[PDB]
Amino acid sequence: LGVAQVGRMNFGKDVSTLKYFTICGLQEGYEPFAVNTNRDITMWLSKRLPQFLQVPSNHEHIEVTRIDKVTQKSFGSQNNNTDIMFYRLSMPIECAXXXXXXXXXXXXXXXXXXXXXXXXXXXXDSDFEVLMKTAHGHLVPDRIDKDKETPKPEFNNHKDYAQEKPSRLKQXXXXXXXXXXXXX
Amino acid sequence: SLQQLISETMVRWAQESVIEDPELVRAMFVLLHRQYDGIGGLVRALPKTYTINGVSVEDTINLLASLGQIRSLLSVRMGKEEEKLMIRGLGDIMNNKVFYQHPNLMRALGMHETVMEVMVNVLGGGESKEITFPKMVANCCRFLCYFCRISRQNQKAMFDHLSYLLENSSVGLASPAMRGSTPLDVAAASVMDNNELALALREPDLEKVVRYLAGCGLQSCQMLVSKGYPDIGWNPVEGERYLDFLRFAVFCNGESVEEN
Amino acid sequence: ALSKKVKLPTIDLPIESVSLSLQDLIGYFHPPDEHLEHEDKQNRLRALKNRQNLFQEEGMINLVLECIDRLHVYSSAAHFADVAGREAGESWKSILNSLYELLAALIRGNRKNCAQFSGSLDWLISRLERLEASSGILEVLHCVLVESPEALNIIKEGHIKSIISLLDKHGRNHKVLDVLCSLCVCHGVAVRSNQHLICDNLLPGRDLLLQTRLVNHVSSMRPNIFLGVSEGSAQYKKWYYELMVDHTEPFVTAEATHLRVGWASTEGYSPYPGGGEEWGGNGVGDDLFSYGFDGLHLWSGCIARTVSSPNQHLLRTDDVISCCLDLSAPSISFRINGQPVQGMFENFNIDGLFFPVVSFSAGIKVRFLLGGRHGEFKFLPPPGYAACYEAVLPKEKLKVEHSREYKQERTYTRDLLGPTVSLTQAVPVD
Amino acid sequence: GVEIETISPGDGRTFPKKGQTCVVHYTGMLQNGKKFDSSRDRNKPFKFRIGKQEVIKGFEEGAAQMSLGQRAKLTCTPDVAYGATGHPGVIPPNATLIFDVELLNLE
Amino acid sequence: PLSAGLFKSEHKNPVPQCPPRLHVQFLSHVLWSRMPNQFLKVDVSRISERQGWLVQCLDPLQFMSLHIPEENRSVDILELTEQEELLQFHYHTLRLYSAVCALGNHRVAHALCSHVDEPQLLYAIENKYMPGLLRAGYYDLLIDIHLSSYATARLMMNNEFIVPMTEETKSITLFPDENKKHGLPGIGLSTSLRPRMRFSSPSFVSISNDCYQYSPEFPLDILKAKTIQMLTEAVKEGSLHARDPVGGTTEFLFVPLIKLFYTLLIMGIFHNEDLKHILQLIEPSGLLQMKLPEPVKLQMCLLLQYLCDCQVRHRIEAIVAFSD
Amino acid sequence: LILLFSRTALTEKCKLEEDFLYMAYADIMAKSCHSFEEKEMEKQKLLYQQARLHDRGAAEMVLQTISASKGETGPMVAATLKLGIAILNGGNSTVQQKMLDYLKEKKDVGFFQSLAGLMQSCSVLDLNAFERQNKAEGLGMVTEEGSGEKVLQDDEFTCDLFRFLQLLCEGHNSDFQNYLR
Known part of the structure; x- marks a missing residue:
């Protein structure tokens, strides 16, 4: 169905309501799709909310490799049309009752927003990278004094972001305008 | 009218189509045979049936519950808690009062065979390198001894397993902690004070006892040399037990059995 | 001669030869096909049993064990490459896989051989965490556990903990569960020690495996009201509406009946706000595009926060709540029985068309309260705050859809719809 | 350490004292929301005496301050609920518990 | 100290390794949603009374959902029909749940009852749109946690006919067979020694449980009524030979149901009237006349074996009554 | 049923189970x-009754059951020898030829070695057990043992085995007479 288009489906099981079965189908040995059923069909549909999925090996224009000293997760792509992706790690780090802080330390020192509020939530690691002709931006689990993940950027790094996010299902192309709420 | 439609369906299924899954056809044919014979179930079950009284019900219920717990424990591998529960159940069935007034009920229930199949599981694993779970062996041996003692027929029942248990009768001896509970002692108790069983005691096992006695008189027990005993050139313990069993086998009711 | 130290490479490394030999021996132990005559299948079974017996009685299981020992001293194909050559480096993985397959085929059916080498499980479970042969090691351990019950006697807490850590590290594998099943019972007999170990070490934390629960079906109700603030045409940015209840029930079948109320945002200026997709246990407040209140806690993004209030109680019968909403500087507010609550959802995203909504699970009788012909207010609105019967645009009707879609208990005569537009309308000419 | 958050008042008149039997209907849950117990699933209320050391302390001392018909949220502490060992199989060590307890009758 | 050393089991390992679970996940659009077959049926007043806007909802409706923890997301049970990996994994999970308490181990069953739920099992056995494998797994788990122990304890004493000499025992000496009748199997009076049944109540707020010796408690009357109703529905469904049996094929519909009915019949429920109704389901001369697959007739064989064993027991009891 | 029994007897084991x-x-x-x-x-109704089931595989089923015991005197061979007797009552040259063809097409030794092992340990009147039972009866009224007073063990089994060996060569089947040597 297209924009503002509503319809109706009939898989059978109501021959008293089926209209054009006797006109065509009744004589050539054609049967309704749900004539011999004791219950209705589940009627699956296409969902809108875009959840996270693992990168499949048979996926064009998005390749994710794995190496391994330090452990890295390199990327790759071969395409002609560009967009923005929303790559995310699978397992999220949970925070206890007391601990509730998060600082983004770049190449230099800690200079970012003070997003340090989490009583007890799950923060899934993620990076939103734009797809260039060559996109070698990747994530590296490193260590200095505590849990540190370095999403190492490369040339043409001006619109890719990297942070930690809870369950969030929104597909678009924006910098801010993220949903928020402050409870007093 | 149940046999009618059962036999009808029974022949109809097999005639309709060839049937894979041999367990299905096995169950089908045993059902058909049961329906046609009829009295086979009766002749099978009446030996295993029993009636007691309308007064002693809680006691026999406790006995049956303990026996069911024993059987359920048989279906599980032996551990420390398993040994503890088995010992508790054996004590309970020994202390129950129905155990004495109706000894035929125990044979009809096959309790001796259950205890026998528990002790064989414990006695397995090894032959001369481990006698682990000794209390479980002792409890089974004393239960079987008591079971064979209070009867005339339970001795005949245990005489069948006497042949097997003489192969591993060497366990539990050479230690004055179980002068009672022992496979050799339960063998002696089964063949004790019955001229019929003493005669029926042929010679597939008297020579076995003689070889065990000779081995004992030629080699001392390594456990003794480990404890710190002066290592005499022979063993006076396993020999004494074998001699006691042979005495029980030869002498009966005050008159020596001539053939034995 | 290559792995002991740095020696001259005049060594015989039959890489392709040993690969072909393993590929032939694996088929040499190929189990008979199930699509075969019964007597021919039994003949092949007896032949393979005799073969396995003669191969085991020569101690070649220990030989392939030593081979995989000497091959496991590396870490990856790259580690083996710069030491043993390009061919050996690129074939090391396949050689390890073939060796594990051969070891499994040699023990697939025999009860004697497994009881012979059961003493090597202390090594098998230790190298089980190689991560490049874990499938082979797991299959081998499964085939050796399902055959001999004595091997379960030597499985200690360390082995079970290692298997559970493998299941926690390598993801959801359906073969680890089969291995644990064979660890619980082997041949009609159970081992209480291993059962207790599994139950006490695998699922106390509930992180694994997949948990489950029985929740209620919740729905939402909203009127045909849309509130959009921006530069230019505005709607006074002030709204207010009340809610009362006639009869309620806390626990209808097994759980507390869902009952929340608040204001939900939208995506842009179009319907279908983002949240719990549909037909779940998510009402208002269970997402970042809705803000609700239920009498005890304030819900925002499926996270509740308790707030103080005079006589704080659940929304029992004959309770009148009134929701106020200003858009620009302040935020949504709730007052229970007139006296306001001590919390509000300040500094939230004002993008979207807000609308009042109420979420309920079952066993509920709720009444929206507006002014005019739609209802009658029970209390007095604060100064300025208008209502939804006034928020409706002039010369348009006002009804109540559910929240998004055709959440109606109807037959096949349901008007399934595709995408929609942003109402085509959500300044003069220069 | 146990704290109480009332949900529905129970007229605060009858309180459990030593030597009585209380009838409760509760659906416990872990700290992360993972439900681990309930008395509404089996559709049979939970009967227990007060002061006989048969239920957990975090439950008994909390129930001893409630009223008839009063629903409450009982938040427990690991040392007062199960300690550093927890319940083998269900409760992990050093875990807090939450009980939604309603008092049906107080005898 | 590390990212990987925070969401895994071990934490004292400062080496930054990456387990295979760590894989990049992108926001994808290839996803299907399932429209439920039952809704809430909310009725608006439609009168627009001058005293408010009325909305009413009375009929309850529930559903079960899996919770993936490392994704922190809830998914309805029926959505597993498409995802074969989660379906197979949860089937094996149910198999493991049944295996850890297979034999007479009750310390673990008391934990598993709360580990899954009490009535969620009832919902799973009641649901029609189940993937089949999950339906069979839940049926087996329900049998294992409660019914299996007493069923086995009662089946071990099935060939041992101990009968007291009570005045009530001296009443079936007629065993009605003359005047053109044969009676009904399992109908009459037993007065035979059989192991008593008792289930303990699963409670984990009670410290120092006495022994939890027997089994977790489970409501049997609702279960037997529910089994009779579904068995009637199942035979009515199979009589017409549709193409959508409950749980996929017809074996998934019949095998777990007939297995649960058989183990219920073993354990000493279905008093006389219930046995009459279950008999009239098959006896009229049904279920034995249908075209049934091999796993269904395999359970029918055991059912008939029990119907013959009860007749043998009745004969033995009559023998004792006359011998008195 | 005959195929089920034949498959059960053909499954490779180490000891013939009870198989009630x-x-x-x-x-x-x-x-x-x-x-x-x-x-x-009556001899023709006997041929008809034998043809009612030896064309369904019983001639080979008996052979396989005897071969699957490798010389163990038990209640399984004691019933298959009686089945062979019932199927070879009289000179049934057809059944003899069917068994001979089966033994020649499946060159199995586990049948002849099983026959040898069974015959080598059938029964012998022992005098010691006889006088022992006599002394037991003289001392006390002990119940008589069922299996021939425990002095001749399974004499019926021995007679059935040798009657089976006779019926296998009944008539003048020189082929089987030479194949038995």
């Missing part, structure tokens, strides 16, 4: 079988 089903049905199959016209009409 076989012990129950091979007796029904054995008792199913059995002035010039009055003696030939």
